[PDB]
Amino acid sequence: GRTTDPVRMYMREMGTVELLTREGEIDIAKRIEDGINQVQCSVAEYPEAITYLLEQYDRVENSIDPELAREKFAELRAQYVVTRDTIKAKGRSHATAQEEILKLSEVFKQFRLVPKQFDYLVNSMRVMMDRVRTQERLIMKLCVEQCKMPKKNFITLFTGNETSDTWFNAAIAMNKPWSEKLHDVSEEVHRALQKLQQIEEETGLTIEQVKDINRRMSIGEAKARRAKKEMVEANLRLVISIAKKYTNRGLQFLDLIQEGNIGLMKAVDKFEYRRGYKFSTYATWWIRQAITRSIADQARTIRIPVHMIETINKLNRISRQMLQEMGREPTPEELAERMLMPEDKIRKVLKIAKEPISMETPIGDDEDSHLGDFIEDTTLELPLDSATTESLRAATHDVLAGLTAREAKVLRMRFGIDMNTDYTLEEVGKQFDVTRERIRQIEAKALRKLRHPSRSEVLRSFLDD
Amino acid sequence: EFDAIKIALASPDMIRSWSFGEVKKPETINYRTFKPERDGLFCARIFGPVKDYECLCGKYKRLKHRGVICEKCGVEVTQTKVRRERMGHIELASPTAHIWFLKSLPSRIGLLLDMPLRDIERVLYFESYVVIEGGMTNLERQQILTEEQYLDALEEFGDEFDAKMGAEAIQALLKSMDLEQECEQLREELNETNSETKRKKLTKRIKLLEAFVQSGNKPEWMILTVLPVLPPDLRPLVPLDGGRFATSDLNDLYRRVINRNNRLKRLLDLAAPDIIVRNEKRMLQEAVDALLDNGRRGRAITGSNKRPLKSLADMIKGKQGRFRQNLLGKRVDYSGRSVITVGPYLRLHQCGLPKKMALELFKPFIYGKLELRGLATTIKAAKKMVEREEAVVWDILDEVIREHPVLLNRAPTLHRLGIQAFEPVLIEGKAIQLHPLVCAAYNADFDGDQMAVHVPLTLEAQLEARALMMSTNNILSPANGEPIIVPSQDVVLGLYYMTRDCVNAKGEGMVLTGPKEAERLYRSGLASLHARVKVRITEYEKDANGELVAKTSLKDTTVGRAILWMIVPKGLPYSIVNQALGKKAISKMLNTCYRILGLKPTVIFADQIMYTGFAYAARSGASVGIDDMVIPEKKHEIISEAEAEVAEIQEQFQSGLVTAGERYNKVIDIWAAANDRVSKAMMDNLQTETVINRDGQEEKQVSFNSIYMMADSGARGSAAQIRQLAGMRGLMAKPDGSIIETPITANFREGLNVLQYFISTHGARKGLADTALKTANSGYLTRRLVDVAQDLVVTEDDCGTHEGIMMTPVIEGGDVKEPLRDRVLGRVTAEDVLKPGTADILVPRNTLLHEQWCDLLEENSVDAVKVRSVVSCDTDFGVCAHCYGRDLARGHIINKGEAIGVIAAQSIGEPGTQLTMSSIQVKNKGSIKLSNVKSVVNSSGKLVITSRNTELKLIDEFGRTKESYKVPYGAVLAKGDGEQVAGGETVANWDPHTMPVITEVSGFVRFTDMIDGQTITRQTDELTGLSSLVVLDSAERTAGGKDLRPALKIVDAQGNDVLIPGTDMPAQYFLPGKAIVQLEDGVQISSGDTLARIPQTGGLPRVADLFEARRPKEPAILAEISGIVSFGKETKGKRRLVITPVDGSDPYEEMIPKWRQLNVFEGERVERGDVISDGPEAPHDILRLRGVHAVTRYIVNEVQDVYRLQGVKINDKHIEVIVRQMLRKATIVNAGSSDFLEGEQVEYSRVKIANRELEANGKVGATYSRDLLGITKASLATESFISAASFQETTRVLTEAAVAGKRDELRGLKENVIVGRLIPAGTGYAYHQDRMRRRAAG
Amino acid sequence: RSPGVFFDSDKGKTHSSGKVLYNARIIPYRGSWLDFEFDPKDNLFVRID
DNA sequence: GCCTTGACCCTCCCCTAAGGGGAGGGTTTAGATTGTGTGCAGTCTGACGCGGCG
């Protein structure tokens, strides 16, 4: 396309959308709102396996009268306890049921945007619906291994009848030998189908009404999603016009844009058109919040917490005006007196605001000598020290041979020489069954002999450290 | 231990099995307590502990528990060194493309899928779709779409087809394809379309698919899903003094990847619109590309100081990468440097070393020696004794350095005599003292230079420093076999002043008993050094079987030569000292002393010469004054007599008699002549102008002027510089190259003007600027030569060939420039040559031609010998000792195990800084010989020949060719063959602006083959009235007329074409445009009459172009095969030409532009190789048409043409080594059951040792052709990827070696230098050999 | 180098025919570069930066 | 000499009553505002290989 720049590639794919007018955003928000309540409608007459609000009003048990908070919850359930008495009559799809449960929907429409409370009721069937799905997958991974059979008669009448296994009698009807080529495995089909039939027991309702109105419940959750998408896609110029005042502060342009878009996606989710204000006035807050939060979390090699960021910024703002006013830079005393903090903290803050230098920094007249060439390894031992360590080990091994073997084993155990660990008196006397005190006696013996001048001046040579 | 190195692509499971855990966030370290944050880039749970045997919290310590893993902080208790070995990884949220396998041309993805790079770079930016599956539809695999066409296909076809976008699409394409089926269907469907343009790409794609199938790789691993992370200690974060930190750039580049991958993992959970997820995937791709190779696919990401960040690929490649900076040369311990100065009292094996330098460099030796004598109890007391500088320390130091050699080195090291081993002598002071005779191999002097000192530590290094590198084994040069220790500046002046003579010297006439009496008389004050006397002298010789026989005589000589004779050793003749000696005579002395006596007498004799030269130069008293520069008294008149001429040649321009150009070009030479007159007057007034009188009266002798004495002896100076001191300076050039008109008529003894000085500064700066900007070209050429030649080593003793090359002298360009003796000395004879009779055998036919054999060849006269060469050696992977010949620095047959490639490269490269960057007469009398000839008698009683390529040679008294020319075609030879003519006689006459082309036989000329309206005019010379039908230019062209190119032909009394004796030939030739023909119609001519006529950078660049095998921009055209020539189908893009064998097929005909004047007419019969035009020849054609020896001979002669023009001497096998290395590849023509392809390029040794085994058990082998590659294209085409990767272009080498799946066997010298092993050459050759034997054992 | 306009040519070295090719450059203290040039077939061309 | 008592002694860590001070982390904020920007860098010459268009 004759270009490889991704900022132009973005600003080009972003310009194929039109800006909205004051009525466009209102009637987009209206359908965003009514799809999410069409869903809440569809959740209404699902069986008691849902987490329905019977005692959610009691689970929790603008400051509204307690008598108002206790009473208006009695309207809905006062009609609901008598309404779904008709769950039995004429199957599961009775028309009085649709009429009065969409009258419960007439009641339901009153409400508007809410936290994940509503979410946790539709999840009430998530954990239950896909379950059903996956179980009828199991039957299939138990049929295809043994026999091959055309799927569009079987699964079609599977969708249709759901009364009993009598639809398998529709498999032999065409009189081809693939009818009962299956042998000794159909009880596994009956296994999984029977377990989902006891799932049907706990639900009490057949699958082709639950999935039937889930087909229309999925219409609301998609029709809200699509309107949210085209409410987001029409406002990207706002993000791009805000995020151009945060440049040269540690992030690149497209990073700031992709941080602003995640805030716009929340301003779209929290909007309320009834309050009468435009969309820009509410969205700018979330856009700026996202960009500001990402500048303080990224964009430093060594990360500083947010409270220290605000302290640094405040001290910069004070020193600017004191420099404009005095004509000089103020000493930390003149900053402590006005910032009203203890001077040691003002001295502590002033060290934390420096970014590490690159190891490729050219140092000299040329550019073949770098800063990283003159950096020395500090954790190495000098060879004079290695030789000294080995010579001292040999000298000690020679002096430890003069005195008794049993009387040197105790020194080896007591100072840990040639062993994996140091030991204590009682655990050494464990193997000697000698008293707590005799060990100390023989140690004061050995250490008294070992400094007699017939022996000491070979080891004394080392202690000039 | 290990034996090889492999390279391949890395799967995701391989990258996950190198790692110790996943990096999840950009945290480096805590800002208050600088400890590594968990799961960040410096994490101590993944990468290891930051202190020895400590966890991070502090719970565990003290090396009791060594394998425990702390439960609080997860760090295991171990040593911190492991933070240099452990790696981590990053799991990417969407696959990305590796930039190397996409954008290093040719792209491997576009070559594997057969897609253009534009389509791939459009699918990778979410800018177009691509069809993966066709289903059952009109769309097919790899079809490209746009969004609208994708929507149309969706609403029209639905689910059946499959189209994707981004690197997931490309991974699906690479993953779905089948390689074996595809390559086999490229096999049988190439033979129809095996046209060349398709042939090249089809065979390239075939070998790529076959490489992927055999190597084991999978094509989809070129798309990344897991990323590795380098260990933390190789990209450190380090505190400086002051609390400031410093960091690497890979940290900056890893953080961007991590926190653009995390954001995509967030957006894929918020379920955002796709316009935003696409922007994230693009940003992630760009970030990974900048981490791998920064500036390759766009703009380079820069840091907060506006410099581009360095990447993982910039740390490997280039002049400052790992390879050239840390692996091929290092910094070392036990070494120092200092200023050098001269010590004149030293022996040749000795250097002076300061006491303090030696005390520092030798510290552990002194510690051990101190505590062995019991002088110190422990090493830490020895340290303080040494630090206090007690008196016994200086006595331990003197016996430590006793018999411990020391290596000295001065940069730049142009050849191997730049590092030499000496024995040290402790001195006071701080400068190093160097012997005055080794300053010529070093190129050193004492205007401020500095030298480096190195100490060998082990027993083997000491043995090698004594036996191989000591300065008393290095007296000969390894480029030519000449001595290198010749005396330079004051040895020469002192020896020259002591062996001169003078007239009427004090003490003239006496008769003395020997040299001792002459010395005793000179010291006493009774005689002079220059006095003519008679002395009795005893001298020795050896003709016995190793014994010396003496003889005495009385000789006439001077005192000084009798004094000098006490230095010369026993066995040399007196005639070497009886001259007045100079630099050349002294070099001759040293060389004959080396030839007769040997090495050790030579190294004693050189020292004695140095001492006595210094002593007598001191006693002479030579000085320089202002009166020693004598200006001739008749310069002032030569100057006026040139100025008068330039005035009277200006006034022939002011009156319109001469042009401006000729006026300038005449003033130039009338000033040059006066300059030459002044210079010769000056030099004759100075050279013998001494009138010293004798017993009765005056006479003349050579001068004792100081300047003349130091110029004539060869100590310092020349005539060209005394010319500027005492003559005039001359003519100056502009910076353009133009010469100014008025010259500089002054000299340095008299002083220049402001203007003469100003115009003299131009050339000074031009020279100073050329030097500095030429040194770089010379160094770069040396590096390429070393890289092509580095792995060639003498491997065997005798290969057993009978091939060779024919050595003759070079006699062109004038007199004999190179005798035959200088070109066979040291070589081995290829066949049993015989002195010019018959069966004069001198040979077991393997004969090292040492000096006695060359004398035997020169007492007879033989001028061609067949010798042995390396370009014809039959040994594979090396040369044999007999094809190489003599070791030019040792004087005997080469030893097996020698590194001849590095020596060849260094010898050719070292002198590169001195490179600049109408009728035949006969001199002496001898026979005249002709070759390549075909003759005819003339009408005027002379000889003519109808050969174009003949040769005319002059034969000496005995039959050795002394001069050789070639005559132009059509020329009339003044005299015939077999004549003994004297000098001063012309033998052939040709026109300076014309050459005629003659008839074949006496016949009757007809105007035919041309009409009016043709390329012919009727242009008759109106003043003289002579005109034939004249051939025209293309400006007077009539295109419809050139149907037949005009020529006037010869007929019989039959009216038809004449017989030619021997063959049924057409007697006449058709000539190209603009021919001058004025021969009458109806006026007939004889055989050989004038029918028609023919009207009409050196230095380092040329050497580099010869070794790089460039193609000239006007290459001559040669005959592909032998056959009768004719013009072809005449398709008029430009002219067509064909040749036709008398028996064979002739599909070969090709294009020639009409600007290219042809020299071969339609009746010619040509043989394979001869020219169809003129122009510089191309070496690939010389290798294709003629053999290997022809291109070898051409290259070595054209290279030596440049070196000899400057006075540089290089032997000729040093160029043959390079030519052998440029010929290592072969190309297959017909496989024939040989497991090779039909136009693949293979190594020549592989083909050779395959055919030697196929043909062994009765089978048909392969047929091939040889190739010629330049030095830098043959360095890169070798079969080890480590040498090639460390030479140049590391990216291409590594990507190709990676997808191919190569391995490396570590057989050269550089491979073993990289990994720190013993090289296979020299004292390491035996070791490797033994190892190779175990390769046969297992 | 001063700001202003500079007329230059390559002297028969770029094209194989040995033809000289002229060009002209305008160079400001601050701004962008504008230059005109000739080609083998005698057509004026322009380019920016 | 080769062991057993009964006294004494030391350092290190955790604890008391009623909060105080700070470090480091979470969340929202409703008049409207809808496409970058540096007073860029652009700046060498020669050889070679491949694609795109006549």
Ligand code: 118
């Ligand atoms: C410079 C420019 C804007 C703000 Sb503000 C703000 C700050 C304090 C009190 C009220 C408003 C802001 C909002 C969110 C995140 C970061 C900064 C602000 C917001 C919307 C419109 C105008 C100003 C601050 C400094």
Ligand SMILES: [Mg+2]
């Ligand atoms: Mg010097």
Ligand SMILES: [Zn+2]
């Ligand atoms: Zn721990």
Ligand SMILES: [Zn+2]
């Ligand atoms: Zn050989």
